[PDB]
Design a binder for this molecule. Structure first.
Ligand SMILES: Nc1ncnc2c1ncn2[C@@H]1O[C@H](CSCC[C@H](N)C(=O)O)[C@@H](O)[C@H]1O
Ligand SMILES: Nc1ncnc2c1ncn2[C@@H]1O[C@H](CSCC[C@H](N)C(=O)O)[C@@H](O)[C@H]1O
Ligand SMILES: O=C1Cc2ccc(Cl)cc2N1
Ligand SMILES: O=C1Cc2ccc(Cl)cc2N1
Lengths: 268, 257
């Protein structure tokens, strides 16, 4: 009926979100181990690489929805878009990205991820070049709130509508329930042009994860709930695959059961 | 040969394996070309067996990155103790070891098997069983009671022979010597400088015999090899740095017969 309470709880909880702990929890080993091809990191990168490798997802502008403190989700993307917008709710995350953009030593090191992306893209690109291009193509880092009908605000800086959207582990991680999730998907969809593409990666059947002091409440979603929401938002689903989280990667940082990858094209 | 007593490993790694010659990003540089020759050759599946020996390793490992997944027993060698020490520092992940990761990465990249560079380094470190003294000017370069399994199924040698031979004849004889280490029907991957007469290694100034591709080809023949492949990389101007007067690099894939 009324979305304010749940959304308020969410915003409250994220005030405690610690980027460094979150990076360590999910992007340092064992989950950040890119050597095991059956690991989640390599699967995520592979979903992205293969999708962009079709040549079917291109344009001038791309918006990454809920970037947090991570850039891996753009490694394969960056060679297909001149203009990239990164976004996040939390200033601290936006500053994390700032540190990487300035190429500071105190910044999180993504070079393994950059290398791995070069590896599976199979074009013999060195990772320093991939990183240099991503840094050059990120044109802005913006506040965002997906619960707003205009997630970027009014008169945003972003080129709208975008040719493509990327969003990894955001919607389910900030929506108290499925209806909120659906509305969030509707909101970000207004930023995408008709015939444009959305690459959505997320947690399956997760109810909580840790980011330092912050223990965050997640709406657990299934593949089928994800498919239906995409259709409900005006997408044709081109691809929807599932990674089942291996027991050895269940580290107590969350109760994630799996990860989904969706390639969807906005009808129009 | 006394000149090699002033040879500084770090200065050599600096001159040849750090930028610009060590930049692997540009596909037209010497580093990537070398790795490609090695990778492509092994990818054929025709160079294989159980044991491999690297002749004149110096302080470098890149020349075995593609090799290591085809040979369970690897022997590295050099004339200088300091080079063997520098190798030991990398093989044992000791302090102040040279950083080869860029090369491991590129080998993984070129090979295209989706392998992470750490697994690659791990395997190489696991398969190098020993680092031995050696002198190619000796009829038995490894000495008599060598811990090395002989004959080897395959040899690798990069920038050693021409770099240690006053003249063509010495070069030919040294090739003769190392060839005795190789099992008949075995393979030799030989990489070397073309038309070079000197190079620097810190305080060391080394004399080199300037050799041509045809001269390299004829040497292998005269040593009893069938030349399966012989390619030339011409050294671009921007990689002419003042550390030597190398004109090009040759890669030769030869088979003892
Ligand atoms: N109301 C809201 N609207 C849009 N993004 C939000 C939000 N509340 C929290 N977020 C951001 O959602 C992110 C979830 S973490 C995922 C980060 C990154 N995309 C990855 O792939 O690892 C956090 O960065 C959080 O700050
Ligand atoms: N008389 C001799 N017999 C065998 N090796 C020798 C030698 N005199 C010097 N060497 C070794 O020959 C090497 C030349 S440079 C090292 C080349 C290295 N494998 C790479 O590819 O870059 C030096 O390590 C040097 O110590
Ligand atoms: O591999 C992934 C990365 C990631 C981010 C956030 C959450 Cl809740 C779960 C996972 N698992
Ligand atoms: O690229 C290469 C590597 C190398 C080793 C030794 C010498 Cl004398 C010259 C070169 N040039």
């Amino acid at each position: 009926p009324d979305s304010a309470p749940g959304q308020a709880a969410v915003a409250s909880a994220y005030q405690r979100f610690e980027p460094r702990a979150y990076l360590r929890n999910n992007y340092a080993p064992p989950r950040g181990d890119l050597c095991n091809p059956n690991g989640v990191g390599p699967w995520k990168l592979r979903c992205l690489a293969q999708t962009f490798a079709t040549g079917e997802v291109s344009g001038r502008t791309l918006i990454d929805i809920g970037s947090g403190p991570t850039v891996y989700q753009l490694l394969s993307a960056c060679s297909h878009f001149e203009d990239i917008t990164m976004t996040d709710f939390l200033e601290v995350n936006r500053q994390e990205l700032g540190r990487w953009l300035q190429e500071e030593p105190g910044a999180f090191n993504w070079s393994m991820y950059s290398q791995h992306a070069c590896l599976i893209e199979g074009k013999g690109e060195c990772w320093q070049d991939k990183e240099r291009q991503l840094r050059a193509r990120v044109k802005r880092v913006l506040p965002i709130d997906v619960h707003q009908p205009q997630p970027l605000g009014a008169g945003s800086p972003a080129p709208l509508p975008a040719d493509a959207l990327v969003s990894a582990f955001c919607l389910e991680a900030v929506s108290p329930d499925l209806a909120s999730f659906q509305r969030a998907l509707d909101h970000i969809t207004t930023l995408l042009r008709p015939g444009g593409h959305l690459l959505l990666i997320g947690a399956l059947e997760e109810s909580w994860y840790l980011a330092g002091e912050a223990r965050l409440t997640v709406v657990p979603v299934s593949e089928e709930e994800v498919r239906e929401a995409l259709v409900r938002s005006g997408y044709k689903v081109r691809d929807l695959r599932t990674y089942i989280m291996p027991a050895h990667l269940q580290t107590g940082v969350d109760d994630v059961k799996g990860v989904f990858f969706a390639w969807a094209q906005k009808v129009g």
